[PDB]
């Protein structure tokens, strides 16, 4: 196919030699899902600005307002190094040490009487 032969070149440019045949079919299903939610939001933003033609600033708005919610990332390095030095210098107070099966407090564990219904 046309758009499925370009998908095998995006993977081969990323060095992915071996892949399942259902891998191309669902990256095209995601790429179709992503463009019909940019352009769906683009004409919502065009009707907000009251213009009959969806031009390039509408797609510039609909991309950066969908990338602000959908595609997140891990926390940044200046945030990870601040919570590290707050934790690595904090003395982590105390709890109940010697308890044979050593464990957190019982509201943080998964050890409850764990009931079930009577069969009748």
């Amino acid at each position: 196919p046309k758009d499925a032969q370009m998908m095998a070149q995006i993977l081969k440019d990323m060095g992915i030699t071996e892949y399942e045949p259902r891998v191309i079919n669902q990256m095209l299903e995601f790429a179709f899902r992503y463009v019909t939610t940019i352009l769906d939001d683009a004409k919502i933003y065009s009707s907000h600005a009251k213009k009959a033609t969806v031009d390039a600033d509408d797609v510039r708005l609909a991309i950066q307002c969908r990338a602000d919610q959908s595609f997140t990332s891990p926390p940044p390095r200046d945030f990870l190094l601040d919570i590290a030095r707050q934790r690595n210098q904090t003395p982590l107070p105390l709890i109940k040490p010697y308890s044979g099966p050593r464990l957190p407090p019982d509201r943080y564990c998964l050890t409850a009487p764990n009931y079930r219904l009577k069969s009748l």
Partner: protein
């Protein structure tokens, strides 16, 4: 991705009159997201140690990028289908795009495979890799035999078990021949033992000695490790050393067991024709022998039978072409045995066996190329050998086909 696919999608949605720069803007955004996910699905493939990139890797790569591995449907409310995947859609390019709703119900479900178990074996014994099936595999000096003394003892035990004094001993020895991986480099001595045995074992027609050797040949053939077509030259005569050949023993009784041995020999011959096959050497050579065994005047009747069986078990087309112009000769031979005058030789037994085998083959061929109309007296145009009983055999075959 091509832009001429993105305009087709846009105009099939209600968004008409899109510019080329608008359309090129779509195909570099979505081609990045395919490249971003396939690079991210390769992380799950490398952490799976499978180097495969299965269909589930993209389901976790999508969930990692906070996109629903929802395929083919997108829920704007997100609650019935969260980031759990539905396994994709089993769709094809060459599909029918319309099925009947009772075709999917009536098909049998595939077998759930075996659960995961833990078996242990040995990769290395003090540095050396064993050849178990869980592993990939001036005076001149006094030379040594190329077999070890375990190998000669093994060979001696397997050959003394394969002459069938005890049946459980035979059966293990036959399974040992059928799956020993290191049975190459002992195979000349096994082929020579078979070949030499049949030739000095037809001097006196010792049926068991022969039935055990034919089972040894069958156990040699289905072993997947060893390379056999270097030894098939000596083996073809040895396995066939008593197929058509007469019996120096009591021919009339054990004529049942030797006929069964002949059937086994036919089956091994058909397996040989299916394999070891190159152009015009093996199958055509045994076919030519069998036919000049058939077209022989005053033919040995224990032999009018072995060669008939050999020709019969050669497959679909061979009886479709070789068992057609000869019915009259078969009938004349049967009529002569019936006339008599006296039973000097087991001629009558040979005739009955040959006629029964030929009649069964003729039914199956007839059932195969023609409708089952006029099954009463039309076979009288073919000398009336099997007639209505042949028609009944064809009907039984049709019933088996209906059951299938």
């Amino acid at each position: 991705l091509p832009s001429e696919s993105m305009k087709v999608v846009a105009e099939s949605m209600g968004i008409a009159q899109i510019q080329e720069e608008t359309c090129q803007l779509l195909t570099d955004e979505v081609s990045y997201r395919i490249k971003e996910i396939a690079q991210d699905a390769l992380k799950f493939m490398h952490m799976g140690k499978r180097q495969k990139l299965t269909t589930s890797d993209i389901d976790y790569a999508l969930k990692l990028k906070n996109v629903e591995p929802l395929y083919g449907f997108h829920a704007q409310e997100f609650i019935p289908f969260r980031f759990a995947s539905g396994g994709g859609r089993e769709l094809y390019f060459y599909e029918e795009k319309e099925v009947d709703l009772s075709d999917i119900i009536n098909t049998p479900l595939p077998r759930v495979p075996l659960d995961v178990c833990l078996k242990a074996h040995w990769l290395s014994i003090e540095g050396c890799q064993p050849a178990i099936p869980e592993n990939p595999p001036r005076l001149k000096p006094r030379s040594i035999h190329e077999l070890s003394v375990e190998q000669q003892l093994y060979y001696k035990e397997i050959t003394e078990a394969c002459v069938g004094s005890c049946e459980a001993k035979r059966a293990e020895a036959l399974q040992s021949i059928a799956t020993d991986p290191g049975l190459y480099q002992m195979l000349p001595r096994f082929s020579t033992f078979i070949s030499e045995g049949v030739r000095v074992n037809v001097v006196q027609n010792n049926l068991a000695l022969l039935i055990y050797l034919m089972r040894m040949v069958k156990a040699l053939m289905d072993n997947p490790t060893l390379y056999l077509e270097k030894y098939v030259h000596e083996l073809i005569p040895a396995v066939m050393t008593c197929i058509v050949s007469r019996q120096l023993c009591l021919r009339p009784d054990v004529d049942n067991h030797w006929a069964l041995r002949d059937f086994a020999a036919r089956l091994v011959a058909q397996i040989c024709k299916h394999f070891s096959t190159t152009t015009n050497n093996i199958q055509s050579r045994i076919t030519k022998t069998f036919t000049k065994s058939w077209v022989d005047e005053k033919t040995p009747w224990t032999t009018r039978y072995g060669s008939i069986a050999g020709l019969a078990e050669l497959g679909h087309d061979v009886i479709k072409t070789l068992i057609l112009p000869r019915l009259q000769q078969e009938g004349e031979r049967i009529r002569s045995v019936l006339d008599g005058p006296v039973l000097s030789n087991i001629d009558r037994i040979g005739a009955d066996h040959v006629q029964s085998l030929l009649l069964k083959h003729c039914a199956p061929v007839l059932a195969k190329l023609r409708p089952p109309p006029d099954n009463q007296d039309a076979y009288r145009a073919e000398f009336g050998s099997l007639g209505p009983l042949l028609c009944s055999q064809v009907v039984k075959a049709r019933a088996q086909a209906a059951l299938q």
